[PDB]
């Protein structure tokens, strides 16, 4: 047997960041010096080990999370980082030990009008605990006065769209991200 990485990478449709996907792996040796070259990869950074001595190891359990963010937000998928995405969408723990993979997908997840399938959570009262996935679409209460689930002033829908135009700058273009955990 081998390890399936074509599944989580070459998947035809990807997940939104707030509702990120987690795939488990329970296999034999995995080809990591071989992913570094398996394609071009605008980001390939590991926070637990030298990338060349991954093939010379195997683990108790390995997870692959995938989602889409914006490029200037890819820097947030790393330990000890704060911001709109790490606070409210996908936190990595501080002792995170693993590797972070991302690449431009302007031709896949954009459309000329602007592809809006992909969402993020903008409002939350508290930060996410690491490896937390919060999927509630409950009206966010910005005020003293409570909402009871009606959008209005100080009563905001917590999820907002990404506007993905092919016209965008690199920071605002969609990047697909895969996070290998150990």
């Amino acid at each position, epitope marked *: 047997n081998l390890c399936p990485f074509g599944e989580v990478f070459n998947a035809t449709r990807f997940a939104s960041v707030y509702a990120w996907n987690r795939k488990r792996i329970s296999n034999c040796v995995a080809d990591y010096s071989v992913l570094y070259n398996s394609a071009s990869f605008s980001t390939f950074k590991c926070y637990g080990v030298s990338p060349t001595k991954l093939n010379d190891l195997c683990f108790t359990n390995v997870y692959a999370d995938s989602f889409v963010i914006r490029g200037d937000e890819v820097r947030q998928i790393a330990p000890g980082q704060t911001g*709109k995405i790490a*606070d*409210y969408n996908y936190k990595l723990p501080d002792d995170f030990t693993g590797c972070v993979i991302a690449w431009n997908s302007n031709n896949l997840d954009s459309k000329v009008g602007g592809n809006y399938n992909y969402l993020y959570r903008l409002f939350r009262k508290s*930060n996410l605990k690491p490896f937390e996935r919060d999927i509630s679409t409950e009206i966010y209460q910005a005020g003293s006065t409570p909402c009871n689930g009606v959008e209005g002033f100080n009563c905001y829908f917590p999820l*907002q769209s990404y*506007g993905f135009q092919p*016209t*965008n*700058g690199v*920071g605002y273009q969609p990047y697909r991200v895969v996070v290998l955990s150990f």
Partner: antibody
Amino acid sequence: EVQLVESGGGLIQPGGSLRLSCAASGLTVSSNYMTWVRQAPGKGLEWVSVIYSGGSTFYAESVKGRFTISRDNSKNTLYLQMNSLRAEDTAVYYCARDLVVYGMDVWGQGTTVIVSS
Amino acid sequence: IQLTQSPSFLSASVGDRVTITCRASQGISSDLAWYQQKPGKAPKLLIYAASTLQSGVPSRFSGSGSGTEFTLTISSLQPEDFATYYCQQLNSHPLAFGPGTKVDIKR
């Protein structure tokens, strides 16, 4: 009523320190992106600091270290602690609420900070 | 991301149709807001999402633009409308404002 009422501006020698208050009403500051903006005389607006509802704070590179943004959930107040003040810190300091995707709808009256010796 | 405005100063008289332009360094599709500021006073939000009317804003103010070039439009200028107008990138973390466009009384 929906207000942000500021206070604490005045006259300060260079290197000194000053603390600006934003007293909110109509919106909870603990629950919001609150932001400090300034306008140097005869100049446009300029972002100073922002604090997120979960507590992350970010700063304009020109004020990293010197300034400190803070909040007091009990008093419903946002703070800007200005340290190591400079002649280029002279400005009107504005306090605003940021619905990031919906603009900055609620501003403060403004408060003037003159840095001179 | 850096923002610019074409008429630094704009001559116009009561009744006229005025147009201000904001140009963004790279592409930020429809993430723009428009503020109006009179002297001594706090900025007032006018437009968000580059074209939506902020609530309570007179309907003579309008927004167009997507990608990299945006326009604020006052269809019939009024006495109340002489002020400076700033664009801003919709953001939390850095806040890009425009330099400002001042609208003169024509002479």
